[PDB]
Amino acid sequence: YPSKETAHWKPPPWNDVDILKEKAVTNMTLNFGPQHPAAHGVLRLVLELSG
Amino acid sequence: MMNGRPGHEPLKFLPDEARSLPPPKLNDPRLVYMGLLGYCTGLMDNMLRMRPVMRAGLHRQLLFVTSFVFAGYFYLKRQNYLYAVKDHDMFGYIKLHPEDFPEKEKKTYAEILEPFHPVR
Amino acid sequence: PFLDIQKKLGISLDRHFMFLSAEQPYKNAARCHAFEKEWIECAHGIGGTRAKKECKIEFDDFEECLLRYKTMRRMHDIKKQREKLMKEGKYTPPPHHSGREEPRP
Amino acid sequence: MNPITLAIIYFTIFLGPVITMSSTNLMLMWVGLEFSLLAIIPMLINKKNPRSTEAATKYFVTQATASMIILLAIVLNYKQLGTWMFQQQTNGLILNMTLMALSMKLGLAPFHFWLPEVTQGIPLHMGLILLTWQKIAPLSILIQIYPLLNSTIILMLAITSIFMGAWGGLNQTQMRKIMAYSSIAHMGWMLAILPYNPSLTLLNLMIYIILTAPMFMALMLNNSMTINSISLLWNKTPAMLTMISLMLLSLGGLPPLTGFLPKWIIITELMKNNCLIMATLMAMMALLNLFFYTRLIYSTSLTMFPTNNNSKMMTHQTKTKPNLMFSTLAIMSTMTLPLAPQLI
Amino acid sequence: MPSTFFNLTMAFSLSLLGTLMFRSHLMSTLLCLEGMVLSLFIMTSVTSLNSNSMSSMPIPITILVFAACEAAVGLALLVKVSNTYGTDYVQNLNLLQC
Amino acid sequence: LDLIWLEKTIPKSTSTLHTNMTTLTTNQKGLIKLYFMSFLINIILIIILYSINL
Amino acid sequence: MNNYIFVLSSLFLVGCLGLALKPSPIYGGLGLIVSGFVGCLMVLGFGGSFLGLMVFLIYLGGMLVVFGYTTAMATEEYPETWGSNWLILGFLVLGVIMEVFLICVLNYYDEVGVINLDGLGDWLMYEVDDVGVMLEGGIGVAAMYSCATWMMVVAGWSLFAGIFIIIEITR
Amino acid sequence: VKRFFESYHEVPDGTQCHRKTYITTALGGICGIIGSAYSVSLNPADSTLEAVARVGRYTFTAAAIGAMFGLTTCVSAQVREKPDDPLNYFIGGCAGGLTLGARTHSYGTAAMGCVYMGTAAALFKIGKLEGWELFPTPKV
Amino acid sequence: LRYGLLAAILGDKTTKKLHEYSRVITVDGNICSGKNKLAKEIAQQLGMKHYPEAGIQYSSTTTGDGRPLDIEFSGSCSLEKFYDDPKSNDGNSYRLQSWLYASRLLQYADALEHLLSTGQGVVLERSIYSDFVFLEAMYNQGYIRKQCVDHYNEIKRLTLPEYLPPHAVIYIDVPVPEVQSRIQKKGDPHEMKVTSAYLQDIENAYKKTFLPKMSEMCEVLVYDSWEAEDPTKVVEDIEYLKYNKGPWLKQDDWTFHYLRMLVQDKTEVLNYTTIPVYLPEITIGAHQGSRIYNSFRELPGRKYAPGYNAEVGDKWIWLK
């Protein structure tokens, strides 16, 4: 029974698996920078981390 | 409500008090009705699995009938024992508390006067 | 209960630490052991609706041992009257209530 | 899943309620409820999709608060009387808080907004368990304390469950929600009479189980979750229409089927205690509960719908799904009215 | 004793009001459940020590056991919520109505 | 009478009433926040009812 | 030193209040730790040592994992502590005001029975056994191995099955 | 206080029109507040001002229902002196339904609510008169 | 016994059966490239079993008497009619396309059932992972409307993830004039009357979509016609493959168990093809559908389960 609110209710899928807006893999960006002692003084070494 | 009855043994199917009750005949109408239930159950199990009806599982139908009757006999013995327990407690209670159930006796239609309601 | 299996088997998995007066580890009486024992022994054979009116004195005694309200109210009344007298200049406490006594033993 | 994990989880689900029955300590009853809670979730969430995650989260968050409220009630009772059992002469506030928490556990209205969602977000199995095996122990708690309960809000919760279940199931195309609203209405029928002769509560519970389980199996046999999916049943499994019809017309209580027996004897034992007009209201809204069952069996049985071209492969291939208990549970239902004195 | 028991009851009531009144996050709700657990523990233990009922002293430990199991599975479902939606918020679990 | 008014009074009034109450009842959005707020309202009303009745 | 227990109870109340206002799980878990410490202290005040210490240990171990997870899942760019919202600050201050006002009210509506400010510290311990030994908590809790060997079984099974439950939820 | 709403029945209809009137009005306002709470928790508004407007609308509506119901009841008992007559409650329920159709601009709702509220109120008076007990205690 | 958890525990696992040539392998290409000749020889040389392409009549051949059925039981579609009248209002095109998708699905299922049970490798050609090629060909021309493509992609979304991909695909290409020449030299009046645009859309769909997205999961072995010939070279290349970069590496005994139970039930396989998306080109209507169902159950070998049919010669039916 289509109300004014429920007009936008698209039905569900059949297998109960929705198609989603896939989130971005927004990893953490770190500067393993030049001042770092493991760096030899002059190495920036940008790196992406998943943890 | 009778679970607090005295002598109520817990999770006991047939107390020895039930052994004084007359058992069913084994020709009883509801027992053959349960056999009919089992027969129809076998027939439905055949119809659901695309097998011939009345022709396929004559061991399954016999098994269903036996199960239904062999359970209904004892369940009915239990239920008869329970109704007997009900009536026993009730008669004992009216015997214990007669004042609340007075020995009433009623008049005749000659002495009492109900009103007449003409149809007309 | 619903499925009285423990009675059907005789075991006691949990029905031996239901109430206070039940077998503490080393035999240390829980307080109001006597009152709970008395209430439970009056309410036995009876069930419920009749024990709720034929063992009400014992339940009241137990409720006053456990939650202990009437003694609170009594000492409150006493302290109230004492404060009133001491503010009226009528009552002075004795030596063994201001912290100056001869300890007994 | 692997076999050891399944054994562990199903054994825990069996022991939750079985602990909740054979336990005088209310704390151990709470323990059993928590077992059921903790062990059902891996199977609500076995498919690992957003619907399953949401269903499991809603179930957990709704059941944990009710568990904590029941524990509040138990702790207050222990403080009051120094005992882990609801005696008489406790506090009505304690008992009512307990009853409201258990209502939230079952799904009774106005605490019902979580059950259709959760039942929608999970497979056909684990809706069966959720609606049958998880209603029992919560009912056991009430069954053990039926004289202590308030006759007022017990009946308000009942009536609200009936009204809301009927008006919810009226407009649902998804069957996993229709069965949930049916559960809500039937739990209303149970809890109305629970302070009056509690054996009839167990009667209605067993009837409801024996109806719903075959129905969920019927939906399993083709993974039916929609009216338009159960309507394509005269082409796939056309020997199930009879039993589905009789069991839906049992769920909506009609006389010759045993689903009218619970409503009938419940109205009887309520009229014995002058609960006349509330019983009349419930009996009359059960018809609105029946209307969508009638529409459903119209859609699938009496006015056979359009089918597809790909459904002929299903005709070629064979099935093994009916488990030999579909027939038994559907035939003990729909045909066991004359055995009613042996049921009560 | 009666004063602190009243205050513990009111603390449980506040934690209950919290876990009922949601915000965007979920772990805050789980923390409210933990606070309810803590208050009930304290009330049970205080009663056992007041009444000197040592036989009931195993009860708060069982409460902690099962409550931390509840927190464990809630945290597992939290992991799942994050893996799906990425943001832990509760207002995204709104696709079962359809 | 037969085709309009006895259809408007007895059957169609019933149908409109029940489908309207169905609409305003079951048109929820699956948010735990709103459901739990309603649960709070129910708790409040029941403790109020107890406080009044006693 | 008689209002000790009322002070501890009121601090527990305030902690659970600031918890219920639901700031970031960092400050929320800080409130949990404060309230668990306070609960341990009052259980000690009623003569209970082991139970309080175990409260503190278990809640510390839990809040550690809570920090680990909230840094991973329940984090915002602006975690929204208490004072960040004038509204939440107002609810906190109003809760403290209503605590004070309601305690003053219950100190008047009844002489004693709900809250006793004049009689306070007189009712804590209730019939101590002034001569005793093997009397503390720890004996009762150790009765899980003797005279309460069902609680141990059922909790052990809870944890054992919880392991499998967690593995399958995370799988 | 339960006594305040039980004082509706200490003197019969046709007497103390004002007392019964704003008793019933308070009752209707209570029920309207409940309805507003359920309508704002579930299905909220786009703003707290819209929500408060909804609450006031519901509440004053139900208050009007109750006010007209009580007024009409005690009037039709004052006129045509017959306090033990559920037709007065029927007429009052019809006035309530017509007010529901006024505040909610619909004649269909007006007649619907008239019939339903009138039958309900007549049944209420029959219950108060014959000794019907909603929410009975278990006796058997 | 029927397979299940009990048999799995008893020790009919799957990883104990796979040795080296327990491999799904699909041979793909355009209309006439030599896939039957190639697949048959691959199966001869490696020990696999050749599954021919899954036409309209596969559920008929793998069921009952193994004979073809009338065109109204095993579909209602024809490929000849599709060639000589593709833009018919009667939606023969998508009816055919969806029927062949379902038949390829059942083919893949039976293939896995043989693999996971016996361990024997399986050869295929033009599986469900390459059946959209003819669909996009139909849609680039005016042979079908877009709603049918949506139906197709939805059913693929429902069915495809539940199955594992092939370890390798063998796509043999021919230029469009050469396949058209091999068609004109094939001797079929219905295939002769096909456009080069259809075949070019097929080639483009293959080379653009099917090759890469399966190279993310399979070992592509693109060959040409003069390498399609000399099939021993293809087999020799197959034997020395490093079968990496696939989901088959993250499958233990229980993944195999649940896949093999999904595949044991063919209605569990075909449920998402019977969905009530009411397209005019797939719907059949109650009268026609009932007529067909009754005529089908009025056939010999049908009307009951397989073993329960005395009209064939089955016996001991009264003790089953």
Ligand SMILES: Nc1ncnc2c1ncn2[C@@H]1O[C@H](COP(=O)(O)OP(=O)(O)OP(=O)(O)O)[C@@H](O)[C@H]1O
């Ligand atoms: N999914 C489909 N859609 C439309 N038509 C198809 C589909 N699958 C097969 N066909 C048709 O069936 C015929 C199959 O020929 P196929 O490519 O199988 O030849 P073959 O048997 O491999 O031998 P050769 O390759 O040597 O011709 C083609 O004419 C093609 O048009």
